[PDB]
Copies of this chain bind each other. A is one copy, B any other.
Amino acid sequence: SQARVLHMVGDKPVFSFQPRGHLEIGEKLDIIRQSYYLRGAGALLQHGLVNFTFNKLLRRGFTPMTVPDVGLAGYFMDHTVAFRDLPVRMVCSSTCYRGLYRVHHFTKVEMFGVTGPGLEQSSQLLEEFLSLQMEILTELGLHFRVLDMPTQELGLPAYRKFDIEAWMPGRGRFGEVTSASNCTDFQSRRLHIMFQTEAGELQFAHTVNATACAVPRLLIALLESNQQKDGSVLVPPALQSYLGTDRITAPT
């Protein structure tokens, strides 16, 4: 019926002041401008988040893919996978079209999985994708909660669904930053995504989907969370390589 809190990770940050919204921080640091537009350290944050996640998923054995822009499944349309290749793990960084809360275009990295027969395989894969999401978020220093979304209440094209909300102090609330869902044979039935069994059967495979990074939301969470009383925001260690610093300090 309603969403259950499955897990809690990290702590709410403590402030001696009233936390500011990501827009105020960005403007004070000259990393957000204008429509909207990232500049300097903010742009490095965006590209570094994408790269950290993409590399993490590459090290775990996800095959990368790129597309000219729903689609992730569609590229497996009318395709059959051998039993020996199951599960198939795909990672794709791409530009998607739909405060920085809702911009028309943004970069997102997505996870896609095609697995062996049945709920056991598909659920194992969904739990694996959720774990990757929590690992990435933990390594970024964010405070977040994992919630079980209802599926048979409205919805339907999902047997299980997990959403992750990261804490946003400037907004003062939790906001969704990742999603992951087990679509089972829905997508495979409609797109003819088959797997061949050991005996020689072709059967409808299972598909699993997950967001590995929605940057606008993660940016908001990092800026509000890591902000300082000086309007500085601290850089998580995982991103200090791409930024070249542990603290953004605003120009002169």
Contact = CB atoms under 8 A, between A and B. Distances in A.
Contact of A66 (B38, B67, B93): B38
Interface stretch (A46-54, A147-155, A169-177, A228-236): A46-54
Interface in A6-46: 33-40, 42-44, 46
Interface in A52-81: 54, 63-69, 75
B47 A65 contact: no
B43 A64 contact: yes
A104 B38 CA distance: 25
Q: Main SS of chain A's interface residues? A: mixed
A155 to B, nearest CB: 29
A119 interface: no
Interface in A93-113: 93-95, 103-106
A93 B40 contact: no
Given A51-B51, A75-B37, A66 B95 contact: no
A39 B54 contact: no
13 contacts: A37-B67, A37-B75, A39-B63, A39-B65, A40-B65, A42-B66, A43-B65, A43-B66, A46-B66, A47-B66, A94-B95, A95-B95, A95-B105
Interface of A: 33-40, 42-44, 46-47, 51, 54, 63-69, 75, 93-95, 103-106
